[PDB]
Design a protein around this ligand. Sequence first.
Ligand SMILES: [Mg+2]
Ligand SMILES: [Mg+2]
Ligand SMILES: [Mg+2]
Ligand SMILES: [Mg+2]
Ligand SMILES: [Mg+2]
Ligand SMILES: [Mg+2]
Ligand SMILES: [Mg+2]
Ligand SMILES: [Mg+2]
Ligand SMILES: [Mg+2]
Ligand SMILES: [Mg+2]
Ligand SMILES: [Mg+2]
Ligand SMILES: [Mg+2]
Ligand SMILES: [Mg+2]
Ligand SMILES: [Mg+2]
Ligand SMILES: [Mg+2]
Ligand SMILES: [Mg+2]
Ligand SMILES: [Mg+2]
Ligand SMILES: [Mg+2]
Ligand SMILES: [Mg+2]
Ligand SMILES: [Mg+2]
Ligand SMILES: [Zn+2]
Ligand SMILES: [Zn+2]
Lengths: 100, 87, 129, 81, 216, 96, 208, 125, 25
Amino acid sequence: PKKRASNGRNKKGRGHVKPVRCLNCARCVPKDKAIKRVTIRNMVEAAAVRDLSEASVYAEYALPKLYNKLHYCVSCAIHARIVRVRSRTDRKIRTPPQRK
Amino acid sequence: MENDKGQLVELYVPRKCSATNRIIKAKDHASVQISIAKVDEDGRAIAGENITYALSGYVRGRGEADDSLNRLAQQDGLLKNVWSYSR
Amino acid sequence: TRTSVLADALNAINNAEKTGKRQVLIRPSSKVIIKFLTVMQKHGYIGEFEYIDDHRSGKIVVQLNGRLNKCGVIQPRFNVKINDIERWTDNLLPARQFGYVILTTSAGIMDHEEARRKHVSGKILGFVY
Amino acid sequence: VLVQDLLHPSPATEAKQHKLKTLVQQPRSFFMDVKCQGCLNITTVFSHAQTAVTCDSCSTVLCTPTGGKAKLTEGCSFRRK
Amino acid sequence: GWTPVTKLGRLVKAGKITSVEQIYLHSLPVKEYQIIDLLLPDLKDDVMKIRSVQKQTRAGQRTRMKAVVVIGDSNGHVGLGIKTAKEVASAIKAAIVIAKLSIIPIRRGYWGSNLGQPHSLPCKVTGKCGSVAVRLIPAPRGKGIVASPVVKRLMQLAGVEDVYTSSSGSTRTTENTLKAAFAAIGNTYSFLTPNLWAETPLAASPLEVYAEEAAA
Amino acid sequence: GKGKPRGLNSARKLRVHRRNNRWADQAYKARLLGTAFKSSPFGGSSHAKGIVLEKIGIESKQPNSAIRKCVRVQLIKNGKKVTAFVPNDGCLNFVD
Amino acid sequence: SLPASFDLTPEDAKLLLAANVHLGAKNVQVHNKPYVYKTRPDGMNIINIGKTWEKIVLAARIIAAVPNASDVAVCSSRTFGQRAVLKFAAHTGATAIAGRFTPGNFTNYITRSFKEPRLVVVTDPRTDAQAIKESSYVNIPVIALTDMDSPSEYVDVAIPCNNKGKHSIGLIWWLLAREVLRLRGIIPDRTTEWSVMPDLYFYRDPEE
Amino acid sequence: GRVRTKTVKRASKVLIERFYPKLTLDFETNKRLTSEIAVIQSKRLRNKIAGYTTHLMKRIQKGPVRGISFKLQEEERERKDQYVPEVSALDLSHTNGQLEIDADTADLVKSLGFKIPVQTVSISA
Amino acid sequence: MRDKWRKKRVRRLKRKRRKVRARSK
RNA sequence: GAAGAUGAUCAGAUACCGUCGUAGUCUUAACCAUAAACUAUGCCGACUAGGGAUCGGUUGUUGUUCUUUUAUUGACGCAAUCGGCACCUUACGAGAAAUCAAAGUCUUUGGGUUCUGGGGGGAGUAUGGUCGCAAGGCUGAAACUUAAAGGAAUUGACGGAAG
Ligand SMILES: [Mg+2]
Ligand SMILES: [Mg+2]
Ligand SMILES: [Mg+2]
Ligand SMILES: [Mg+2]
Ligand SMILES: [Mg+2]
Ligand SMILES: [Mg+2]
Ligand SMILES: [Mg+2]
Ligand SMILES: [Mg+2]
Ligand SMILES: [Mg+2]
Ligand SMILES: [Mg+2]
Ligand SMILES: [Mg+2]
Ligand SMILES: [Mg+2]
Ligand SMILES: [Mg+2]
Ligand SMILES: [Mg+2]
Ligand SMILES: [Mg+2]
Ligand SMILES: [Mg+2]
Ligand SMILES: [Mg+2]
Ligand SMILES: [Mg+2]
Ligand SMILES: [Mg+2]
Ligand SMILES: [Mg+2]
Ligand SMILES: [Zn+2]
Ligand SMILES: [Zn+2]
């Protein structure tokens, strides 16, 4: 039977969407279907932000962030636990998980 | 329903909804019968003397019961300028 | 496109009656619609109805009294001989004691009972009960 | 709403309807009497004019066509007929 | 010794309510089968089908018995009950109870002329359950119940003498066939006919005129 | 509109469509193609005589296990060879 | 019809307005549109308290028609209405259901608090959905205090008011109690000041 | 753990609903009392029941407990919640003597046949 | 077997049939 | 990066994995005409229920930012409306169910019209025709064989799935 009313993607009122490669395995996946995560990480881990600040020649120098947008196919994402199998009724919930 | 000789062969002439005129079935358990007391000129409720309306379970299920009572009660004088014919 | 204004009129009445509404708006109007409604009104299946002139085909507002179980058209309008009326009433009507098959005869639009009284037949047009 | 007056809609709700969706369709456009600033000469201009109308007296454009209602030029006053 | 637990039961234990039509006129819910026994003393039941259903478990199947019972007085009242139990005897005994609780009135009418007592249905009716749709057509006085043995038994216990039947779908699903026919036969008091157009005044409920006898 | 024409002058379309679609009914198809006349060993007859060629035992299908005792028969009317079961306990000894 | 003494008095209008009864929710459903007088420019909808008053008298008139006062069940799952319904039951003799409503109280006839009310009065159709749902199983009419966003399914008489107000709930319940007693004759007439004060029927925090 | 079971939790609260006036906050008195109120088959169960009844009794004295009603909890409560202040907190005396309704609401007041003094407040937000 | 490969096998077998018949044209 | 060559793994892998790699991938002139070419949902028309978003146009209006100092600036905000892409709730209603605002207004069976199916295989095969350079496309059986094949859902068992 039909598992999702959206067919597991985000294509409505459209014929074709150009693909993207999974970050992990380089599989061609449609752009609307790929699991996309925007990550803004500190370039230096919090353990090393102190000793690196002491070694700085600049007073009050802000460490730059690392900006990245990750694309995963369904297999890449499920295996890495980026997304998980949800119950039949919990699948419909499409609000971001309440973690942050 | 009656036979040729005129006897009422009908058992159970059923009730009809006051709002939609539908027949209220024997197992329509969402149907209610509102009983509204008559009030004398002293402001007292007259004992055992009521205005009665019946609503089918269909009308109540659609949420139209409230607006139907407003209309039905206004025609009988139970209400004033609460229900408007033109929307 | 719009191929039968009578079917649209009766479909609108059926949908309004099933939902408990006591009035329905019909567009467009026509002579056949008005004469079909007059037959329904004469037998008490509808109340007063209203014709609105808009310098076009027109509009109708019908008052419903909750007695109408179903009204419908028969497409196409089959030719009906007098001996064929019995077959149509058997298929379309719920019982032999009530309900009407509406015909268009050269004597005018009328129910199947009136058609038998004046011994006329035409094309079938619809039904009501 | 099961009971409702379809023949006498509320004039407030009647004015919000599309021009084709009233009981009897009626245009919402109108004609205006346009006074250019230079002189005083009645010039009838359609509200939704598609032409850059100029008054006869002085060759001055009264309105510029837009997507909907025409836009009257500065110094031009209109009065609905 | 039956001690009623409902307002309706108390009014029936006393002589306040004497017929089921007073129950039906106000759509009162019936929850005690002793009410039906008092008001409809002459009822005949029939075990139309007995089936075994199984729930697979870790050790093996868990078999239970499902019984379908049709109750009626052959004079315009008919009920239908379906109950599952570990044993056939308990399933049948419990299915009879809920068959009594579901007893509804039916409208008998006339095919053609109204000479004598009503013998058939007053109009064409249809009921649906699952894929099965059962249609009942009024029939003249000669034809008996033109129906399958499952539906025919339901017609006899309801008091219908003359009726045409036609079924569609998986009619061999006996439970769905009986539920569809039961729905169809109950629709006779749901179809508005011109002889019912007259407005009748709304009488007070028996729970109202006898409020103190139903108190506690 | 139910996917079929309803017009009063559409009898040809309705008649041709039914005629085209009865070929999906194998009972109708076999009757008009004359498959019994052409392909059936009996040629459409209910019975047919023949000469016994040999007595042969045929193993039954699973889950049954037995030797169904039949014969090889060449039909007189057309010379075709068919296998015919010989029914009952020990009736093979009546057939030579 | 009705004597003019049943009209909205200026005193009651002051009570209704001081209790913020007229403040209806931002979003109004289509069935509650007749009860809205005008939308306030912030977004709140103003309740036509003239209509609110008339529904109260109509609702109280239905309650007065029930012979046994205990056959009327007044319900409130909101904490703001629990004291009001408890005080309503004391004054009128109705049967209060404060706090949690046990599912099956109307349908399961072997439960402990299995009741058969002839009429159910509800503080809020949303938070008392279970009480309204079961009433639709045993032919029980429902009177509900409804806001402009309150659902109207299986609600026969809707009293347009603010369900989410601490003082609104108590006042509406207090107003019903006064009219039920006025119709019954407990209060001698419609002009005598009632002994009970609208502060009673108001929810009190555990602090006091 | 020392989690009491249901055979001791429900049997102890039946005692409170039935013999609250004769009970007390002392286990020793409760232990002797429950030996004459209930037929307990074993001494160990008697001590467990009396030991939990004492705990419930000790908890009732600190406030109302949920699930236990002993025909004196509400009798003390019916007239306990009778508090009403002298000022109505709804009477228009906390203000200057007139309603603080918004000007938009005042039109509704004007629509009705009322002449009520008002200090209009226009939040307009 | 998989329908796609079942289809490929028959195409290769149809291909052979055509070549064999062409010998005698 | 098909093919091919190669290093690993393996019992074997001319498979997965690694390194190279030819057609191909791009383009111009022509062919081919097929995809799970899918919303597996023909097209046209009418009606039946609530809600909030959003894109395009139009029409009325702000404690808002900005032109420029303000308007005839633009953006934003609030309302209506027509058209779209969709979505949320409910089920009057439909359905075998999954589910569906259409898959509803269908035994209370008829708004107009085109195409397609008739148990599973054999088989989209054989043959003939026709189109194509070919690959192949379109049209398209029968003999024979078979009691099920299949749809949706339930309980359990299992999983080199998650918690
Ligand atoms: Mg799957
Ligand atoms: Mg595609
Ligand atoms: Mg069949
Ligand atoms: Mg075919
Ligand atoms: Mg190798
Ligand atoms: Mg290789
Ligand atoms: Mg490479
Ligand atoms: Mg190329
Ligand atoms: Mg294809
Ligand atoms: Mg797709
Ligand atoms: Mg397709
Ligand atoms: Mg097409
Ligand atoms: Mg459409
Ligand atoms: Mg826009
Ligand atoms: Mg259904
Ligand atoms: Mg949906
Ligand atoms: Mg859809
Ligand atoms: Mg086939
Ligand atoms: Mg077998
Ligand atoms: Mg399956
Ligand atoms: Zn992959
Ligand atoms: Zn000029």
